Amino acid sequence: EDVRKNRLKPLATYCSVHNPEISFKVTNEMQCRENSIDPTKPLAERMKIEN
Amino acid sequence: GASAQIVFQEGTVLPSSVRAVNLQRERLLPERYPSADVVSVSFMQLGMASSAGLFLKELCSNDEFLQGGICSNPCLFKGFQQSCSAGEVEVRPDGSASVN
Amino acid sequence: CSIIEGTGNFDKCVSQVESILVAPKLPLPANIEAASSGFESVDQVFRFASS
């Protein structure tokens, strides 16, 4: 259940508001959200699979 | 006419997705001439022909400027009228716009 | 659409040129060739590479 030991961590850290790698291209911001990894939602909610 | 270009401080931290164009490495200038790292960008959508077409397509599609046929254009002068198409416009001495 | 009517407003024309041509929210591909830098639109050029 640990955050660091989670398999989604390399993608979840790559997709966040803090991360400036996405900010270069506006099209890239929509690309990650469509693959269920939302940068708007916090890390605890982003990693968690709803229902 | 078709495309618009913007080509132009020192040792700035540039993103990985965008590359600084070096005229010496790209075989555009020799080694004897001083090094020139420039920001080279070209957009077809901003070129005279494409810009006029893309504007009318986006402006008239929006509900704000279109009201069941009439497309309000703020760029065009008061009283000026033309057919709703991206065709070439020629001004006739009659006081009307000839759209191809 | 059938008829285009001129309203004559520069400030409204500027905002439309900005939202459509200069700084579009959903811009065109703008590919990265041997001669091109890689920027998608004008707004991103002076934001990260101003001189």
Curated annotation (Swiss-Prot), chain B:
It is found in: Secreted; Parasitophorous vacuole. Belongs to the GDA1/CD39 NTPase family. The chain holds residues 280 to 381 of 628 of the full protein. It comes from Toxoplasma gondii. Homotetramer. It comes from the Eukaryota. May perform an important processing step in the conversion of high energy nucleotides prior to uptake by the parasite. NTPAse-II has a specific activity 4.5-fold lower than NTPAse-I in hydrolysis of ATP. The primary difference between these isozymes lies in their ability to hydrolyze nucleoside triphosphate versus diphosphate substrates. While NTPAse-II hydrolyzes ATP to ADP and ADP to AMP at almost the same rate, NTPAse-I hydrolyzes ADP to AMP at a much slower rate (0.7% of the rate for ATP). Disulfide bonds: none annotated. This is Nucleoside-triphosphatase 2.
